[PDB]
């Protein structure tokens, strides 16, 4: 039932402290939909974000991020919301039984990693003076390495099959977007071999030249 | 709890090292959006970061700001603060200069769990005449918590939240 | 010999009635924890038992059913239909046989806001057995009968805690089964035994405590307790005539006890886990049940 | 369905009995049309839906002739009209029949563009039929010879049972499926004037019928029309002017007493209205939404049917259930006919019943 | 509620058959409740379009809907709908001509456009022409051509000529091929099934075959192709295969602590796709006072990237059934095999391999068939006594041939799958024999909706020894149960052992016949009680089953008193209803079958609950 | 060996008529219009263009044809080169 917001809000933050995400989110949703324009319902929406993230309710977390950013384009705490959106995408990406068996989820679907990289890039470009920028940048590095590994695996397969120009396009895009990764360094030999197999070595000497220059 | 959900595996990421073209050679790499701007550190990484909603004042909270911004007998907050300093917190301000209304409190050890033993600080208060209502600052001092001394944008908001919620209770 | 062997089959028929006897949250599912009055449930079990004289048996019952209803003001009553099939195999001193029974019936339940619930069920089945015994010269024979099983139960759920509820319950059920009459004239002597329609009744009082943790962190619906069952009536009367003379037999009451069950913890939306307990009443009548534990992990 | 159907009260002052029954065959059935017969020299001409048609002798109910016009069924729609020594009929299959009375075989058969819902009418040596499409056609009695096809406009929601035009001073007037009641000079096929008496006094046109499909009645210069959505109007033959208006309407069949005018509301509310101001006299609430038919004057009284097959009688002053009749248990959906001091009511299978007072 | 429909204004066809093709219905037929009688404007327009097609398809080109009217009774309960039309007249297809900047493939279009002269117009074949001409031009890689059709009509000659203009456009190339939705399976397993190679000229047929192969892999509940052009270069198109990964494989566990059996232990996993690696791993085991069974098997379908597969298995079967001596004999069977296979074309695969087996059986119950087998082996033990032991080891070579063309990977709605498995011995083995088995499953639908389908299952098997020998009985065929004749009993059909006295005593149990043949016909229909979302998650079938297994070696002269067993004529026959359900726990079946023509020892079980494989 | 190796195509194809349209001294745009957009270019050093036609019907000798068109860094055709390939294996 409805009552003054004091007791309901106090119980809400108290059970957030206890960590009972179920009852916490039920209470918060009830209070928010009861007072859709309360004095400080924005804090309630932030608590909704936190509850969805910690309760493993990721799609609802993403939807609530989108709703909050649409209703509140400018606020002293946008960086937190965008960081949570990126965290949502990150967490959705990497978690399964391969985590138990330690299988590199590198050549799987990269879409979620791509979206997370986009959101973290938006954040780090936006407010470098915030407090989440360092962890964000570390996540940027990890994600970029991951995408490079995925493209490397695709190129490796296409070489294995014998399609000698799809590999060229793939590794060329890899160079054009991942200039500072291990994957491109390892894929340069794929360039060399592919150019060799086309009877047009003229670019193959250049590939060997750049390989020798950067091999050290 | 209190950290990010995922593992700290990305903390062990490989270094981001670029490559240089040789003589008489060009390189088209600078043609995408996957560029990582260089930024300094001094940020809580790994599980050390405290992901937790930044509780809003419930006005001005840019730094440690705790000024009070519609009331006529707005001076009634000081006896209410005395009531707050009474059984409400059982703690009379360290310098309760009510005549000058500069009732600066003393450092405490209030606790709210969250894997934290205690978190209390001297939320210094002064009551000027600003804005529509009778102004009253809540600028806190150095926050103690379990640490000897420490401060952070969210951390200072935690101690200020205690002054924020209680002062707003008087409404 | 021949007279006692039929009683064991009547006891097996009582055991078949005893096997047909189940709980309220098990035979027809828990009265709570299901939000919709429209829902389908089932009951698959395989029990066993034994008695003095080599009378051992093992039965397997598979039943399904559905119910559909709407809501009301203070009592969300529901009702529906169900089907069942039982198959058992038993052995004795000089007797051994297998029985089966296919039947259809209806179930209903109603729970109040005070935690008290009631349930009822009624089913008609066509039970046919086929057994061989060398005593009395009968040999091998198969006989069929119609069984009308009617049962009622009720329970008082107490909200002891958020994850604990001590819910006493009491039930009473009566069933009508037409008897079979047969003469052993194939061996040379009449030895005719005639069994009439039996309409026994039996009640049961049981005290149990169920702990139902949730959130997939524990997700364990454990249920401990005990119950006592007493046969109110027993109409297993059979009149036998032979060279020595004429004899009459009648059914007997029950004073049986039943123990708790296993864990039955379904953790996540894709996994399962559960167990069952069996009462090894060796001292009383060398009685027993069947116990098992298994779980399924599907990727 | 959740719809109130009040029971009929019991009142009696005289006992009328059925003169005879006919049972022509599978007539109107569950359909809806304007199948009512015509009387000429003590012989009624009943028409059957399945293509049958029978002439019957009055005061005795004796079969004269009966012929079938099967094709396959025929689906007769128009009412029975007689002119010269012939009868004219329209069918739902977009055909028109000219039958030669006693002979039975069609004197001449022609085709029309659309269903002939409109009751056929003869005037000035031409028969006027209004198709269920937005067209009206004048046909010659010799052999077809469509004189003209005057076009009309209508939205795709109009209720059936289209209006029957009436002639006066050489010009025929007819209502429209949107309220545009118009007049046409019936010798060359030119449309003079029209006006919309039906006001769309609602929220959205989907729930608004706002069309007139009942025949107008002319008295000197005054004439009337009745739309489903209401909008009773008195208008004069000279042009599109309105002497007075009323927001009750909601009728599809009405008669005139010379001084008073009767009507049937949608909720089955019957009142008597005056020439000048149209003030109600009384009302009846015994049968609400029971789908009564048109009232007919007879010996200074009114006779009405119903969709329950319970014939009702009404006093000319203040109304009174002088007699209540029960002849069929399935109901009535036809239009009553009175001539030579005799009343006839059509049914589904018993079809025509001639009553005695 | 709708009441009447009329098509007044026609004089060529009857009203009833015209309205028969309408989805909208005006009146319910007597002895059925198949259809409803309401009013819906959108389906009125749809049926109007169908009516337009059903006139234009037979040379009534000069046809147009003059008008359509919907009305209402003055009671708001019954609705009449009328249509007034213009039939026009019959017309004849004068001829066809082609034009445009068509590509050098003009011969194919010209051949495909050929129509028998003297025939009337029909819009259905014309529409087929545009559709399949577009498909043809897409086969060579023109995804976006534009075609126009003009039916010139000469009424004075009752003729209609079609002028079709084709605009091939530009060449098309695929820049990238990106997958989406594969949460677990690695990109390699999806990419290795493709036939439209990245960086080449597009082929629509190649993309279609790729999506078909992804479907046939059998671990994707739904797959949808999508070809979209890049907003960059004028002629470059990206291709995406939006999949939705499903469940596969199960880990199960159980313990059977009980008085009558002591302790029974069961565990095992079986995935056809291990962690997305693409392997297939099945391991399981059980231990009991009567049973000790275990087996392990691993297969890689892509040992090399052409289609070559390599798979092996091992098994230990020392169950040691001793108690009660109920038609059981002490037996330990341990063995292994390894096989490799390769495809011979796009749709047929061969496989071959080698195997070692060893079997030790002691304390065999007496019966004539096994005594004859042992006599053929050269051993002559006592008839009434049961104490002999037999050790044997066998080298063997096995092979197989598979044809697979199925619209989907599991309970499909098209195609056929056949599989032949041959199993011969080789010199150096104690046993000398061979055995050939064959399975076939053909799916044929009845309409393009692919919801109602007929299914034909056939299983055959036969073998024998060579050089005056005979195979061991323990490797003989069996019949009865799911995946076989339904409803009878698990492994109940066949010759029954003849027990020696301990004269001859007949046994209800079977020993399996050397020659087996069964067949089955199934109607498959949707489930009316299942919503749309789960509609493609269950299956209801009506099955008619027949089967027969016998022994081709039966010296009926020596024991002519007992019923003959060398007679294949003793057919069995059953039928019933089967309900296949796919569950988060896996695939389940449910059959309520009533045998029609049954024999002795049937042990009829009208309720079977097989789990797995299905 | 004998196993089914599916057919493989590895670049934009061209014919004799496509080659005959080529003349030295034309701009990038309309030559791309004439021959389609090249799939494999050289962003390394010079901005030359390649047109490779490859066909490997499976267990058959690969057929290759290379058309290398070198352009100045302004947008016009500098020179061309054609090669029926089939050298080596």
Residue numbers in the entry:
A (entry chain D): 28 to 243
B (entry chain C): 32 to 89, 97 to 107, 109 to 210
C (entry chain P): 1002 to 1300
D (entry chain B): 29 to 99, 107 to 392
E (entry chain A): 176 to 677, 698 to 809
F (entry chain E): 25 to 113
Passage from the reporting paper:
The outer membrane is a formidable barrier that protects Gram-negative bacteria against environmental threats. Its integrity requires the correct folding and insertion of outer membrane proteins (OMPs) by the membrane-embedded β-barrel assembly machinery (BAM). BamA is composed of a 16-stranded β-barrel, which, in E. coli, is preceded N-terminally by five polypeptide transport associated (POTRA) domains that extend into the periplasm. Unfolded OMPs are delivered to BAM by the periplasmic chaperone SurA, but how SurA and BAM work together to ensure successful OMP delivery and folding remains unclear. The results suggest that SurA binds BAM at its soluble POTRA-1 domain, which may trigger conformational changes in both BAM and SurA that enable transfer of the unfolded OMP to the BAM lateral gate for insertion into the outer membrane.
Complexes of BAM disulphide bonded to SurA-EspP cross-linked via BamA β1 (S425C) and residue S1299C in the C-terminal β-signal of EspP were purified from the E. coli OM, and the structures solved by cryoEM. The structures revealed BamA- EspP- hybrid barrels captured as late stage folding intermediates, as expected. Fully-folded EspP β-barrels that contain the native α-helix in the barrel’s lumen were present in all structures. In these structures, both Extended and Compact conformations of SurA are present, as well as a structure in which SurA was not observed, consistent with the chaperone dissociating from POTRA-1 in these late-stage folding complexes. Collectively, these results suggest that these late-stage folding intermediates of EspP are no longer being chaperoned by SurA. Indeed, dissociation of the substrate OMP from the chaperone would be a pre-requisite for release of the OMP from BAM and insertion into the OM. Hence, we term these as ‘Release Complexes’, in which SurA has returned to a structural ensemble that includes both Extended and Compact states.
